[PDB]
């Protein structure tokens, strides 16, 4: 039970040496399996890029997803369907 908005928290908690699996997250995309996979890939790589620079994914995590969606049309549709949630990790 994970989608594109859970990405900054899962990356930070589980670290780098882990496998993240999306059952209903990839398939349930409005456009199909191929744009659904691309949306998940862009969201993961943007968080990895932001982590390496020196940005806290607790405070700036939602800002990274919104910035990546400006050039990726596949992610912009995914952000419309699944709504953003707030994790309370410190």
């Amino acid at each position: 039970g994970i989608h594109v908005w859970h990405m900054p928290a899962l990356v930070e908690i589980f670290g780098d040496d882990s496998v993240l699996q999306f059952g209903g997250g990839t398939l349930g995309h409005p456009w199909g399996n191929a744009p659904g996979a691309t949306a998940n890939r862009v969201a993961l790589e943007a968080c990895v890029q932001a982590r390496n620079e020196g940005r806290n994914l607790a405070r700036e995590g939602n800002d990274v997803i919104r910035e990546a969606a400006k050039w990726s049309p596949e992610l912009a549709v995914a952000c419309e369907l699944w709504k953003e949630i707030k994790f309370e990790f410190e």
């Binding site: 953003e84 949630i85 707030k86």
Partner: protein, 280 residues
């Protein structure tokens, strides 16, 4: 720059405030319902009030849960309620969900005269949320963790008898909003503020049509270019009005700003009165 009536703002303030407030010994109605005549501006006032307050709004269409080929209202209202609850934490501001034309705009003739299967579902869903606002459940992925309570606004012409339990329970509050002379002056004054009309002029317009909907006065502004268009057609000629405008590369038609006078508005007012009279 549109005027808001003080009474309308007050009713919204108290409902939203009280729900968000956490005072012991006090019971608060979760759902507020507003009934009035059509084109009173109930929807327009709600949208404006929220902007001044800066509170986030989620809108659900009346036709979105009335249509047979839409989905499932029971599953939908629940999903929208959860999403609105998430906003409070992330956004850090008050968030309200409102529904328009719960029993209207479906396309059906009855307008709540006769119940439907779909009508029953909304009643069922709403009643569950009103009793247990803190916990709302989807079909799958049941979460133990509680959600922040969210206020609900509903607007319509009238409320069905099915809702009578909720109102007697005091879980729902019904507000009847009717415009007055003072309210009319404000709203009419705001519409024509940009045009530039004297206070005496604005008073005359309301006085001309004492018993009129708010929508009518707004609609008057639209029929100002009619004289220009009619005169324009003549110069061009009926033979070739279409071709030049529809699909031709030329300078687009230019219209000088219409003169604003009280006389023009009275003449326009009479024509719309006549048409509405004949149709009904």
């Amino acid at each position: 720059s549109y005027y808001i009536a003080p009474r309308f703002l007050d009713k919204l303030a108290v409902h939203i405030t009280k729900n968000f407030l956490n005072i012991p010994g006090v019971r608060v109605p979760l759902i507020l319902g507003i009934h009035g005549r059509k084109g009173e501006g109930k929807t327009f006032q709600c949208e404006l009030a929220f902007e001044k307050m800066g509170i986030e709004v989620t809108l659900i269409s009346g036709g979105e849960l009335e249509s047979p080929d839409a989905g499932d209202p029971a599953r939908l209202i629940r999903l929208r309620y959860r999403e609105t609850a998430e906003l409070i934490k992330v956004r850090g501001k008050m968030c309200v969900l409102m529904i328009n034309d719960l029993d209207a705009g479906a396309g059906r003739f009855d307008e709540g005269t006769q119940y439907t299967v779909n009508t029953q579902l909304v009643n069922a869903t709403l009643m569950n949320i009103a009793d247990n606002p803190t916990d709302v459940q989807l079909p799958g992925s049941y979460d133990s963790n509680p959600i922040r309570r969210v206020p609900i606004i509903v607007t319509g012409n009238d409320f069905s008898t099915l809702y009578a339990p909720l109102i007697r329970d005091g879980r729902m509050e019904k507000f009847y909003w009717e415009p007055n002379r003072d309210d009319k002056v404000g709203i009419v004054g705001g519409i024509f503020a940009e045009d530039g009309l004297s206070q005496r002029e604005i008073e005359q317009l309301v006085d001309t049509f004492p018993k009129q909907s708010i929508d009518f006065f707004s609609a008057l502004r639209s029929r100002i270019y009619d004289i220009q268009i009619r005169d324009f057609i003549h110069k061009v000629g009926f033979e070739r009005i279409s071709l030049r405008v529809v699909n031709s590369l030329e300078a687009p038609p230019e219209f000088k700003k219409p003169d604003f006078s009280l006389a023009h508005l009275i003449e326009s007012g009479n024509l719309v009165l006549g048409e509405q009279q004949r149709v009904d």
